[PDB]
Nucleic acid binder design. Structure first.
Ligand SMILES: [Zn+2]
Ligand SMILES: [Zn+2]
Length: 431
RNA sequence: UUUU
């Protein structure tokens, strides 16, 4: 029993780790690389897809699934286990990836084939391959997200997948992992903890009452998946004290995902589940409008406030969000609220530097609108949660993170008495 | 971590 990291090593994208045991070859996630590594999506897996016994998906995010369709494009035909939640989201995630890709390293035929081999595997459901026993654990990062517990050959391995930020309210608490011989964990925020949740919300509401009352615009760049609808959850449970204004979720993808949420209620927190029991959908606050096409989206740049806008991409790497910022970032009455991580080097970081006037889509636009960064809205376990989850495990191999962050976490792990390393590309570790 |  060994685990060979095949992505997300000293990096965050490309998450894919081949589990070798019981004579079987199980594949944990099969995500795509993003941004700078993008090209490497064309390069070879590093293993023979045809020799894989069965693959497990921790969640539907593209960086853990974006490459699956490639796997099949190259021969794989085995089973792909996930939660119904991951399965349903996944369809949306991929279909979009197709349209977004410049260099489509796969096609509709591959996606269709991939989705075809998806077989449901819910929490506490034990799968058996060879002498190997597998099971999903509650990770709380996305609806239906999980961490893997691989047990066999008298050894125990845990692959954390992505862990959630337990402070928030939509998803359930991530679960503590079982005591294992080896833990292959993520460390996206291995360097720092997050701003508390309570105070980021309070601050959020504050920015809202002030911007809306003066009749301005609240521009919220967002990811179409958990993030978009989670912001809506706040608007829904605080709408009573919030000033009346249309809430434009100007992102079709976010819609499709939102439309899908009432079918996944069991995948949320007890709180979210209680609301649904009362016959209500807490992901649709009053005044919500899902903007489907360009014309209406453009119209919003010219229309006056007060209004709240949600658009992607959550990293300003394009999307309608640009066109919004291009036109409302120059008015001081408008507010810009970042509710997710902005990659360094990107426009987000730039705008946050707060220069006199950023450039957006071939034109310099003055920057008067206020800017705010609510890192407390992060969907990832901050360093303090990472330490608590990992607490107790003897051995730990860190994947998913920038070497610096991973290192930072390791120092703490080491000083704590935990044998730890930084997974290297294609270099299986002894379970 | 994808966005007409
Ligand atoms: Zn994720
Ligand atoms: Zn991830």
């Amino acid at each position: 029993m060994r685990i060979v990291p095949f992505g997300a090593a000293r990096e965050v994208t490309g998450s894919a780790h081949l589990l070798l045991a019981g004579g079987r070859r199980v594949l944990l996630d099969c995500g795509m690389f993003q941004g700078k590594e993008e090209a490497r999506n064309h390069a070879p897996f590093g293993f023979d897809p045809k020799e894989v016994d069965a693959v497990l998906l921790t969640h539907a995010h593209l960086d853990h699934v974006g490459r699956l369709p490639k796997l099949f494009r190259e021969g794989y035909r085995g089973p792909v286990y996930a939660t119904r939640a991951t399965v349903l989201l996944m369809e949306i995630v991929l279909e979009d990836a197709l349209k977004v890709m410049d260099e489509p390293f796969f096609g509709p035929e591959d996606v269709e084939e991939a989705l075809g081999h998806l077989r449901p595997l819910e929490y506490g459901e034990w799968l058996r391959l060879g002498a190997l026993s597998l099971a999903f654990g509650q990770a709380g990062h996305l609806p239906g997200s999980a961490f893997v517990v691989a047990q066999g050959e008298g050894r125990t391995l845990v692959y954390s997948g992505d862990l959630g930020n337990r402070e928030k309210d939509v998803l359930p608490d991530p679960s503590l992992p079982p005591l294992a011989d080896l833990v292959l964990a993520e460390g996206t925020y291995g360097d720092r903890p997050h701003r508390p949740y309570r105070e980021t919300v309070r601050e959020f509401l504050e920015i809202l009452e002030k911007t809306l009352s003066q009749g301005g615009k609240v521009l919220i760049p967002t990811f179409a998946v958990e993030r978009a609808q989670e912001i809506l959850y706040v608007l829904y449970t605080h709408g009573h004290r919030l000033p009346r204004a249309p809430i434009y979720l100007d992102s079709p993808m976010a819609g499709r995902v939102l439309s899908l949420y009432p079918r996944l209620v069991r995948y949320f927190s007890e709180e979210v589940q209680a609301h649904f029991l009362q016959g209500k959908n807490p992901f649709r606050p009053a005044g919500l409008e899902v903007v489907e096409h360009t014309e209406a989206s453009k119209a919003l740049n010219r229309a006056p406030g007060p209004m709240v806008v949600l658009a992607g991409s959550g990293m300003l790497a394009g999307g309608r969000i640009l066109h919004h910022l291009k036109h409302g970032l120059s008015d001081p009455r408008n507010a810009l609220v970042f509710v997710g991580y902005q990659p360094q080097g990107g426009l987000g970081a730039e705008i946050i530097a707060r220069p006199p006037a950023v450039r957006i889509l071939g034109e310099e636009v003055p920057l008067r609108a206020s800017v705010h960064t609510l890192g407390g809205f992060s969907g990832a376990a901050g360093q303090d949660e990472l330490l608590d989850w990992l607490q107790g495990e003897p051995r730990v191999v860190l994947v998913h993170g920038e070497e610096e962050k991973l290192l930072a976490l390791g120092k703490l792990l080491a000083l704590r008495g935990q044998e730890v390393s930084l997974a290297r590309f294609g270099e299986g570790v002894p379970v």
